[PDB]
Amino acid sequence: ACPQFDDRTKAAADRGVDVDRITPEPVWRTTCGTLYRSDSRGPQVVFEEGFHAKDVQNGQYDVEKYVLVNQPSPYVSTSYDHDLYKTWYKSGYNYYVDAPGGIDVNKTIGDTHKWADQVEVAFPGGIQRKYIIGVCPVDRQTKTEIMSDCESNPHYQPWH
């Protein structure tokens, strides 16, 4: 099965997320399959730092408002869909994530909002580097992964 942790923000790269300010009430992901994140930053920084959120102290904690309007927030978005990179094909990297928890966005705010088809999992306080498996770069012209240039994260620590 998947290990469950009492700390729903075990995955976070940023200490000090205030779980009680997350609204509306979060439905936490309890599975442990691979998740994906498109990002413009290459693995040199992402594997060293993990994914930190833009604004844990003063960002937008309401999940509905954060989906309606992109704005600094305590959340790092990922998706259940390996192929979401093809929509976001101008972001040069597709990161493969194996992290506990996260807020299942469609379970929390419903499945009819603007980004429901992106099947998102939002990580409050981001995702520490030990939960990032690796990356594949994305070719903008063909919208495909450059699979000969993928890279494992030296800091990935398997946990199940």
Curated annotation (Swiss-Prot):
Domain of life: Bacteria
Organism name: Streptomyces coelicolor (strain ATCC BAA-471 / A3(2) / M145)
Portion of the full-length sequence here: 45 to 204 of 204
Outcome (variant: residue 118 to E/N/S): No ADP-ribosylation of GDP
Domain remark from Swiss-Prot or TrEMBL: The PN loop (phosphate-nicotinamide, residues 132-136) moves dramatically upon GDP-binding.
Protein name: Guanine-specific ADP-ribosyl transferase
Subcellular location: Secreted
EC supergroup of this enzyme: transferase
Binding site for GDP: 67-70, 88-90, 115, 118
tRNA-binding among keywords: no
Temperature dependence, free-text field: Optimum temperature is 30 degrees Celsius.
Summary of subunit composition and partner proteins: Monomer.
Cellular component per GO, a single term: extracellular region
Function field: ADP-ribosylates the N2 amino group of guanosine, deoxyguanosine, GMP, dGMP, cGMP, GTP and dGTP; oligo-guanosine, oligo-deoxyguanosine and tRNA are ADP-ribosylated less efficiently, while dsDNA is a very poor substrate. Also acts on GDP.
Ranges in a coiled coil: none
Motif (PN (phosphate-nicotinamide) loop): 88-92
